[PDB]
Amino acid sequence: MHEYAFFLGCIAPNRYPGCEASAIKTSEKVGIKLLPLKGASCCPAPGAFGSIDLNVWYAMAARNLVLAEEMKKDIALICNGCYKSIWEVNHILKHNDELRDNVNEVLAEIDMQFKGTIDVWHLAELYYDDKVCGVQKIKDSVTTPLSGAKVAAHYGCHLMKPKKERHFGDTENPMWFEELIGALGAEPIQYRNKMQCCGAGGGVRGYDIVHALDITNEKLINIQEAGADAITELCPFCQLQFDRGQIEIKEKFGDVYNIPVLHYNELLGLAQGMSPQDLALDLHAIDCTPFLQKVL
């Protein structure tokens, strides 16, 4: 049973707690142990806080990293934006000496040092790796087939891009996340421009809601045209956009889709037999009941 510190940023615990609950339960069912991070905070959200000040972005991400450093554990994440912040600041401060120095003399005011000893993983990346739980182990753990459901994957942008800074391979047409959805028994479908941004990154969600919603609506149109019955995602930002933004699209525009948006951990819980009440699917703006009727 591999053990990881569970970073747990802002949106999953405070808006979609079923995501974190299913994360812990399903990760324990497969051979992974997710340990609470002691006093972790907002990973300085890369858009809304990196746009303001890169130095304080570095300092806060480094503080989050040195918490798990003192814990002597590897970070595990469930958010693409949190992955950007944590993993990328870890990678930058493992190689840039003057930035290490600057962050360290900022952190020395709170009796705290960064040395760069741990690694950062996304939970879906762990589920895909073969050393850690693999696709076959996921298939083994699945107990409810979830058959006869068309499911559209949204990769997001901060997990895989830029490919010159990550290690997940092709960004033009990846299929790895489609294999994790196929392990659950749901057939993943392909839609036009599947690698498009959801529109919520960089603080655009806050600065220009209509612009962000138009970017989201382009995706929703493509997904409905494909014929999806739900949208899996690996990011609480993207889930919030696809969930709230459907309501804001219904009100600001006149478009109705009613497409449930679920984190992959929530689908994994559904596959492994967790209850909808135990997943808190009532906390989503868009009702999941048609999808539950199909897969149950």
Partner: protein, 189 residues
């Protein structure tokens, strides 16, 4: 464009549209290069970045134009552009640039300079306030505490919502860079 008339609407209408060598700020370019950590002066304006941007088809935002402004040193043209905050940082431009430039990193550096000159949307400042107060950009509320309890999780996550002693360290980090002291001042107006 003959000269300054001091009639504001006519100055706006007949603003000199012609680039002069007095318009270049090499200090601005050097600050951008340092902060962005990218080779931005090596752009040759192929248009791949704009061709990949998801914000371009629905707005006047042109990342290639911002790269050109960076190269030419057009400070007060880049920083005051309201389409500096339409980048979602999706990194498609960086993914595809043939010169290994990070235009989105150039955008991030430009946004930092805009904040230092006090141009910044209010959501950013409100997020600064929230993170200062609780350490969380999206904090917990009563209804989510009730939902977590009904799930079976503790009413608060293991974060600084349940360990408020780390909030003081976060606040010292923010105060060292004076982020709160600038955000509240800008919000006051």
């Amino acid at each position: 464009a003959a000269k300054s008339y001091n009639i504001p609407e006519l100055d706006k209408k007949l603003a000199d549209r012609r680039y002069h060598l007095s318009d270049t700020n090499p200090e601005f370019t050097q600050k951008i290069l340092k902060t962005s950590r990218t080779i931005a002066n090596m752009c040759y304006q192929c248009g791949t970045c704009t061709g990949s941007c998801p914000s371009a088809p629905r707005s006047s935002y042109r990342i290639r134009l911002f790269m050109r402004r960076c190269v030419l040193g057009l400070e007060n043209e880049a920083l005051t552009d309201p389409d500096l905050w339409l980048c979602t940082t999706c990194y498609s431009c960086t993914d595809r640039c043939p010169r290994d430039i990070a235009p989105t990193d150039v955008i991030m550096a430009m946004r930092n300079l805009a904040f230092k000159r006090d141009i910044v949307p209010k959501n950013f400042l409100q997020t600064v306030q929230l993170i200062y107060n609780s350490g969380h950009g999206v904090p917990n509320n009563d209804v989510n505490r009730a939902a977590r309890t009904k799930l079976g999780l503790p009413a608060d996550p293991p974060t600084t919502h349940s360990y408020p002693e780390f909030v003081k360290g976060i606040q010292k980090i923010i105060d060292h860079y004076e982020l709160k002291e600038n955000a509240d001042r800008i919000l006051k107006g």
